[PDB]
Amino acid sequence: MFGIFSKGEPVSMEGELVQPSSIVINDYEEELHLPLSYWDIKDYKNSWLKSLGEGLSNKTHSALAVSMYEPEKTNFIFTWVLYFEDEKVYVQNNVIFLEECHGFSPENINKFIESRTTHDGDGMKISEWHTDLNSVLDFYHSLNNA
Amino acid sequence: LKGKEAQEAASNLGFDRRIPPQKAPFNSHGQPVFYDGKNYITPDIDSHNVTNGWKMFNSKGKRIGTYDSGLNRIKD
Numbered sequence: 001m002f003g004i005f006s007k008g009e010p011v012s013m014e015g016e017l018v019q020p021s022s023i024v025i026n027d028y029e030e031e032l033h034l035p036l037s038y039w040d041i042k043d044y045k046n047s048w049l050k051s052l053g054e055g056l057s058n059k060t061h062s063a064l065a066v067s068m069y070e071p072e073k074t075n076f077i078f079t080w081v082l083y084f085e086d087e088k089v090y091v092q093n094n095v096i097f098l099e100e101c102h103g104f105s106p107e108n109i110n111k112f113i114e115s116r117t118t119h120d121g122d123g124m125k126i127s128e129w130h131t132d133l134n135s136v137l138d139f140y141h142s143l144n145n146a
Numbered sequence: 147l148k149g150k151e152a153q154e155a156a157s158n159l160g161f162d163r164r165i166p167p168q169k170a171p172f173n174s175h176g177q178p179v180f181y182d183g184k185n186y187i188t189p190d191i192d193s194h195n196v197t198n199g200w201k202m203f204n205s206k207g208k209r210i211g212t213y214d215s216g217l218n219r220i221k222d
Binding site: 014015037067072074092120124 | 179210
C-alpha cells in the first residue's frame with residue numbers, strides 16, 4: 001500500500017498539538033507527528049491531493065508535506081517526495097529549507113523540489129524506498145473521495 | 147528520543163545550532179533540526195526507535211540515513 005494515515009487522538013508534543021500518523025511505502029513504515037498549528041489534517045490531505053494530481057499527470061514528482069507552518073514564519077518543512085518512472089515510484093524523505101526564502105508558498109511545493117538523485121556530492125547514499133504506481137493511484141483516489 | 151536533552155545530545159555530537167521549524171517568536175515550538183555547519187540531525191522518533199537514535203539530512207536536506215546514538219549509520 002502507499003499513503004499517510006492517522007493513528008489516535010491529537011496529543012501535545014515538543015510544545016505543540018500534533019497528529020500521530022504513519023507513512024507506509026509498501027513494506028516500509030515510519031511514525032510521523034504532523035503539526036496542526038497552521039494546517040488541520042483536511043488541509044494536509046488537500047495539499048497531497050493537489051500534489052499527487054500534478055505529479056501523476058506529467059509523471060515528474062509529487063512532494064507530500066508532513067509539516068507546515070505559517071509560510072513567512074517557516075524555516076523548513078519535512079516532505080516525502082515521490083518520483084515517477086514508468087510503473088515504479090521512488091520515494092525520498094527531504095527537508096525543504098526556507099529560512100532565507102520568504103517567497104515560499106505550499107501550493108507551489110512541487111517547484112521547490114528538483115529532479116531525482118541517488119547519491120550526493122560527497123558520495124553518500126540518499127535514502128530511498130519504492131512502491132508501484134497503482135498503489136499511489138489508489139492513495140490519490142482515496143484522497144479524492146474524502 | 148529526547149526533548150531538552152536532545153539539544154545537549156546533539157551539541158555533544160557537534161551539532162551546535164538548533165534550528166527551530168518557526169522563526170521568532172514561535173521557536174520553542176516543534177520538531178527542530180540540529181546543524182553541524184554541514185549536516186542536520188533530528189531525534190529518531192520512530193516505532194522501532196531502539197535507543198535515542200537520529201535521522202540525518204545532508205546540506206541540501208536530503209536524508210542520508212538513520213543513525214545510532216553515536217552517529218553510526220544503521221539503515222536508510
